[PDB]
Amino acid sequence: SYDIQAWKKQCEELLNLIFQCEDSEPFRQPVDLLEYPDYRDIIDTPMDFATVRETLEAGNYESPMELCKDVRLIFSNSKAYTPSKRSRIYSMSLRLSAFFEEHISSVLSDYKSALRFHKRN
Ligand SMILES: O=C(Nc1ccccc1Cl)N1CCN(C(=O)c2ccco2)CC1
């Protein structure tokens, strides 16, 4: 497809699949700073899947690359906060990241292809 707008619905669908994954539980909503009092000493930019979905539905992503940068920030924040590479919540993050990367690959390729076709002449 050379549809320049198709990525948006494709990302809505993929966020729906991520919300059905039990591995997304810890990442749907912001970290609570009463249960994790040192979070903002470690993490400069919090991110979660509900913020990603709201930013998409507001029309505040210009490309699936921007959405991808914010989802990758969810996963790098988990890696930066984990006291161990064997922790439950970090382990959930690695499986969810693999799922996300497997599915976003074609969304990015199709978008970049569609832009190149738009500028073909
Ligand atoms: O509290 C968290 N998420 C959450 C938010 C609202 C309701 C319910 C939940 Cl589980 N989080 C814990 C901190 N964290 C980590 O990535 C991490 C890595 C090693 C330990 O925690 C991010 C998710």
UniProtKB/Swiss-Prot annotation:
The modification Phosphoserine is found at S1, S91. Expressed in myeloma and epidermoid carcinoma cell lines. Residues 2-107 form the Bromo domain. The modification Phosphothreonine is found at T45. It comes from the Eukaryota. Transmembrane segments: none annotated. Disulfide bonds: none annotated. It is found in: Nucleus. Probable regulator of the insulin and insulin-like growth factor signaling pathways. Stimulates cell proliferation through regulation of cyclin transcription and has an anti-apoptotic activity through AKT1 phosphorylation and activation. Plays a role in the regulation of cell morphology and cytoskeletal organization. Interacts with IRS1 and IRS2. Interacts (via bromo domain) with acetylated lysine residues on histone H1.4, histone H3 and H4 (in vitro). It is linked to Chung-Jansen syndrome: An autosomal dominant disorder characterized by developmental delay, intellectual disability, autistic features, anxiety, hypotonia, obesity, and dysmorphic features. This is PH-interacting protein. It comes from Homo sapiens (Human). The gene is PHIP. The chain holds residues 1315 to 1435 of 1821 of the full protein.
